Amino acid sequence: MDVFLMIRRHKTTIFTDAKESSTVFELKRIVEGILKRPPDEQRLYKDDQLLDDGKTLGECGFTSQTARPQAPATVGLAFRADDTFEALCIEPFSSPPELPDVM
Amino acid sequence: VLRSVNSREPSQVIFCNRSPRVVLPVWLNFDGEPQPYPTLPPGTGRRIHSYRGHLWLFRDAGTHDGLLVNQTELFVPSLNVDGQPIFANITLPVYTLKERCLQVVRSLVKPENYRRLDIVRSLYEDLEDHPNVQKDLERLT
Amino acid sequence: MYVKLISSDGHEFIVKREHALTSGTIKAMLSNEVNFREIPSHVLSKVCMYFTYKVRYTNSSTEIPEFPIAPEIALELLMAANFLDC
Ligand SMILES: CC(C)N1CCN(Cc2ccccc2F)CC1
Numbered sequence: 001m002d003v004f005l006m007i008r009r010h011k012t013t014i015f016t017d018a019k020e021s022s023t024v025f026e027l028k029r030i031v032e033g034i035l036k037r038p039p040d041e042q043r044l045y046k047d048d049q050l051l052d053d054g055k056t057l058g059e060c061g062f063t064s065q066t067a068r069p070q071a072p073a074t075v076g077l078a079f080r081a082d083d084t085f086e087a088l089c090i091e092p093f094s095s096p097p098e099l100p101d102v103m
Numbered sequence: 104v105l106r107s108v109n110s111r112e113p114s115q116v117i118f119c120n121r122s123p124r125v126v127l128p129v130w131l132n133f134d135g136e137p138q139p140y141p142t143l144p145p146g147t148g149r150r151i152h153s154y155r156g157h158l159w160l161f162r163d164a165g166t167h168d169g170l171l172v173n174q175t176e177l178f179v180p181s182l183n184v185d186g187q188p189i190f191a192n193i194t195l196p197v198y199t200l201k202e203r204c205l206q207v208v209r210s211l212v213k214p215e216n217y218r219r220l221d222i223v224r225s226l227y228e229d230l231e232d233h234p235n236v237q238k239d240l241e242r243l244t
Numbered sequence: 245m246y247v248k249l250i251s252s253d254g255h256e257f258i259v260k261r262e263h264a265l266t267s268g269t270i271k272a273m274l275s276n277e278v279n280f281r282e283i284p285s286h287v288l289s290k291v292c293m294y295f296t297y298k299v300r301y302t303n304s305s306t307e308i309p310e311f312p313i314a315p316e317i318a319l320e321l322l323m324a325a326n327f328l329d330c
Contacts, residue, residue, distance in 0.1 A: 014259075068301075069301065093284075204313060207315065211315050
């Protein structure tokens with residue numbers, strides 16, 4: 001089963017998919033292939049919750065119900081500085097203008 | 104040109120609406136004139152008595168957006184093999200993102216306010232070019 | 245293989261090249277990063293979801309879910325989709 005994710009750190013967002021049975025660590029390898037930071041320098045989050053490398057994405061709450069192509073689930077990403085992990089910061093997207101009256 | 108053939112050979116059909124839209128089945132009669140049939144609520148089915156070589160297409164009943172039936176544009180009842188009814192599985196197509204946006208905007212703005220929206224003039228005209236079966240029938244033609 | 249689409253407000257969206265090629269406009273801009281001076285990130289993020297959605301559900305016989313669009317972003321998404329030819 002494919003789950004569809006936005007991996008997010010700061011002003012970066014990775015759209016990618018993965019198997020529900022794949023592990024948090026295997027997702028870090030995906031991140032490493034893209035952003036060139038090794039798994040030991042990454043922390044992955046769902047909400048405020050740090051994720052265990054050995055857990056599968058399904059056990060971390062990423063399912064066909066919650067991680068859909070048109071509505072992907074968000075994985076927070078935090079990088080390690082110099083043996084110190086940064087705090088998880090995800091910059092929000094911009095806000096739309098207020099709805100026109102005619103809508 | 105796009106018309107039902109008057110075969111008079113009955114063909115049992117199931118319309119299943121696997122879409123969130125209210126579906127308007129449309130039979131192309133023997134002159135090619137589209138004839139609306141009773142609408143199917145979302146997710147519902149309906150047994151229909153039709154005929155071999157008859158021509159059907161399906162639209163959202165409220166907006167006339169096109170729908171797919173068995174992943175193509177037109178549904179033609181064929182021979183019932185072992186007397187089993189033929190299924191007409193009605194689904195959303197993958198709309199272009201532009202058309203999907205036009206759908207949402209049209210569904211939120213009554214057409215008398217399209218010009219009161221701050222968009223390029225060409226979008227104003229696109230909003231007004233509502234989907235309609237006659238236009239689609241000339242396209243397929 | 246991925247590409248980077250950057251929104252008007254500087255958000256960086258990293259999506260599979262094949263997904264980005266849904267947009268003929270993006271295909272020409274790539275022929276790799278692309279900067280969209282006029283597409284803010286709350287629009288460009290939906291465009292990226294659309295690419296995922298389109299690639300997943302094009303040519304699929306499963307029931308296709310509706311692509312959802314909040315009214316608040318409908319207009320900008322319309323203009324972005326119009327520009328992107330997708
Ligand atoms: C000449 C006569 C026998 N026609 C009249 C038109 N009607 C077509 C039709 C009716 C009901 C459901 C599906 C159909 F396709 C029934 C067949």
